[PDB]
């Protein structure tokens, strides 16, 4: 019959197609069941997040999913408009850091430095501790201590200082009485007093010699007048600046000797010589102590003459 | 009472034993059994603190005991002259290194999750020694910075 | 025939294989169509980035893709050489932070602290505002104000201070004239002047008594000479340091009394007594005012004798 | 009969089902082979990380994998408990930053600022450099320099200052001798010395006039006594504060004139007049120089009377 | 003119009504309807600023009106003695809290996408009161830092 | 020796030639061929440094040569009065801009991966000119900050 030569060969070509489909299915299924994927799970809202990595043709229980590990050097971020590729991590000698082209904005972070008591600390409420800083510009200290700081001329130093803790002298004083030569029971002044000022100051000074009164005496016996003389002679570095003779009326020596800075020591020599009334009567002379003051020598608003 | 007889002088430390019992026990066991002899103040930052008790004269770390628990919640603060236990990143990792506060370090005080640093001692005499030590020149940029150029050696430690 | 039993039973095993393939296809297709995946899209360059999450067997339009959400606690980064796993986020009491083992390098960020006016602020161009800081080391200020700072001895204080704002006195002066006792139309000096210096200074001082001149008088009537005496007695804390008698020729008292710190108040008593010429004639005596000046007492480069 | 009409149609229906399965296979295989996925690779430990993006039905060699790019604006992190979505990046004017709701904790980072020598720098070991800062609170400097800082009153200023670098004078001094008029071979003092103190100080001052001694003389010839008189007249701002006549016994002028701040210049006029012994004999008078010292005028612990 | 009568003294404030009209309207509406009566300066940082106007004596927050727009681009700067409106993270979130600048705060100045803080007032009298307040001891570590230990109470706000 | 004749005065610079030969060759080639004539110190921060050598009076950038390699490992440090080459982010990108250190800049010193800044010169005379320049008022917030309001101009750059 005709029916035995067309539809009976269908059982063989159908078998050949079934064998080809079996081979394709074996090739594809054995690679589907070996395939690992990123597994998508759900919240109770329909949100579909990445929950980890697992076999594609399985279910798991959202547990025993082997975590979403990414290889760090393989992840980068793109703008899908220009195609600019930005790696997430940068390698620095077996340490991986974030790319830091992000990382442009921190709000209320806590930052601490290395050592373990830390030198640097930034608290999220904004307390800053530096402890190993180098600052410049606009400091308003409420407490603390300066140690080796050069305070400038234009720094206002409102506040007090002690009278001590001033290097210079501003004023000094010194004093001495003339040697007294005596005979019997009467003494008279006679000798030399030397006043030496050491040149150990950066500024000009004046040696104010407070008034020095000296006098002699007069005796009238049997109508004969005997004068007891007094001679005061002052030497400044050997130069005679004064020479006085007093008979019975007083003479007074006072002076302001100038002491410039760097010119060396100033030596003032006060020498008193007394003369006897006669060959027998001891002298009756008087001379007040040597009193001297060295001042800071300001020549400004105090005019004389 | 403990002596730290250093090359700079003598530092007298009164131990706050009633507030940090096990910390001060650990410190006294180290100082008693000759540990801190010939050990340097390896980390000196002027205005901050001076840190010692871990490294020998040639920058060689010593072998400590197993660490101690942090006792920083005793309410003792990191004020000038107090000793706090120095530790690593771990909160209960303090073994042997300590430091003296040369100034007021408020950011090192805490008893919380952020455990801070446990104060257990106070310099009662020889604060001038600590002041001379704090100002020595320190330059070892690299492995350990702020290492004094000429080491500040603790010659011996004597207990009372 | 042989073909009736060898090529007709093939239609049955073929049908069985087709039914088995139908069952496998129904099992696998319902798994493929229900499967969600991470969807890969393309830029106009062939770049193939992750564009979001969507059904695996669908197309979308790069829109309505349900975002690439990752579950935060599930993401970690590996080194695929040693296998070390580093989580991306660390939990801190219902707050998720970055793992901060990255985060080792920040260049030109903006950092601001908590409160809202912030205490700390770091501008990206490098301006720093702390305002609640505790700094140590190398401060180099161009403006500002110290409030309770202890400036140390080794801090150089280049700059000027006022004459006021010095606690000690350095120099003080004081003066008085002796009480005058008068009868008829003539007066003579007689009385006591007391100079007291309070011990309220930390340093040694000198009480410089500027020269005090006093004298009496002589009158000769009918060859009888009458002496009007003048007596000055100076007491330092009750101790007699001077005693003078002047007839007609002047005597001068001057002294530098030492005033050490902590030894108590110094009291200088100037007692001046005048004696009449006779039982009738009032005394004619003179005595200059008491003038005293207290100095800071430097004993250094002012040598005498 | 039945076998040639019942199981014969099995061949045709099997062929129809095979054609339907061929159509489904051609629809699904073309979809599978064109599908890009995220490729999962393996360490030699069984770890299964994300290694990049590649064709789903391929193998590659872990190389030529086209990198794991994510589109930046599409990545966000979820909590799969509440469903809160947090984007990874925030856009800011064509710049992409991390979300900074993470970024709450930095441990030993390196931070530097913009410019290229940077103004700000934070070394990972805790050295801080600010160099363009604005600090408040608790500064403990070990070195550096203040430039325009207002040091407050309650700042302890332990340390010394120079005697100079003090604006006020504290003490000044000035002196001159009286003009001398001479005839024949003898001179006597007579004239005016004017002492003017400029009112250029903020504090009260004292003008201490150190003792000024003047006297005349007496000569007796043929029982006739001639008195050479000396007169000193001192004017303070034109007002007479002293007037003295000396015959042979000396008079001494000394005074402490108060100089208040803001009252104006103080002018002291010392006028000496000498009267001759007779119509022929020149006067024999003496008067010591005018020495004056201006002090800072402390009225505290020094009392007289 | 507005006077804040505090336990420390009296603070006369001149309102810059021409440069910040809405801020000064809001501030005068609060001070007119006794809002700042019995309210503390809850945030005092010496060298920075003193912040008040939102919390009662027991550290409890008051009910404000709905906020006002930021007017910080009026060109007034955060100089010493000026008052700026305090706000939250939101730019136009300023409601009732203000602060007085006790020093020069240049980093709080701007008008731009970084809106800064709107200065609307100035202390013309009682700067000594602000100076005494700025130096009170503050320790409330935890919920709110820099809270004065003894509260600085605004007894009344008197508007002229 | 190089004369930097500016509107403020004259700055005298001894070139550390033996330690930075290529930097000093590049600097002297710019100085010889009148590059720095009529160029401003565009970036002055008091307490830090003053930076010049790239911009004219109108704040426009000039054309430099190909850059020079960093020679910061010569061991010269960023001390007060030394000139270092200014550069961009790239470590070997220094072309023409320099800066004078007005203070001690320890954090700009290194020879390492972190190349720091190469000191090649020192101010020997005219420091006072640098202190006058360092304190001029600067306000150009936006493109370039710390730009002097009234620009300081290198009138001529004469070399010996």
Residue numbers in the entry:
A (entry chain J), C (entry chain F), D (entry chain Z): 828 to 1132
B (entry chain j), E (entry chain f), F (entry chain z): 30 to 189
Lines from the paper:
Bacteriophage lambda’s tip protein, gpJ, plays a crucial role when attaching to the cell surface. The gpJ protein, comprised of 1132 residues, is located at the bottom end of the lambda phage tail, serving as a key component of the lambda baseplate. The gpJ trimer not only seals the tail tip into a closed cone but also extends a central tail fiber, providing the means through which lambda phage directly interacts with its host. Genetic evidence has identified the E. coli receptor LamB (ecLamB) as the direct target interacting with gpJ during the phage’s attachment process.
A cryo-EM sample of gpJ713 in its closed state alone was also prepared and collected. A 2.76 Å map of the central tail fiber in a closed state was obtained. The central tail fiber of the lambda phage in the C-terminal region of the gpJ protein is constituted by FNIIIs, AHS, CSF, and RBD (left). AHS is a helix bundle formed by three α-helices, situated below the FNIIIs, securely anchoring the three FNIII-2 units together from the bottom. In the closed state, the longitudinally oriented CSF, a mixed β-sheet prism, exhibits intricate torsion in the strands spanning from above the RBD to below the AHS. From bottom side to top side, its cross-section progressively expands from narrow to wide (left). The RBD, the C-terminus of gpJ, incorporates an immunoglobulin (Ig)-like domain, with four bottom loops (L1-L4) serving a pivotal role in receptor binding. The trimeric plug domains of gpI obstruct the tube, with the C-terminal region of gpH forming a coiled-coil superhelix that interacts with gpI. The AHS and CSF domains within the tail fiber are twisted, and the bottom ends of the three RBDs are in close proximity (step 1).
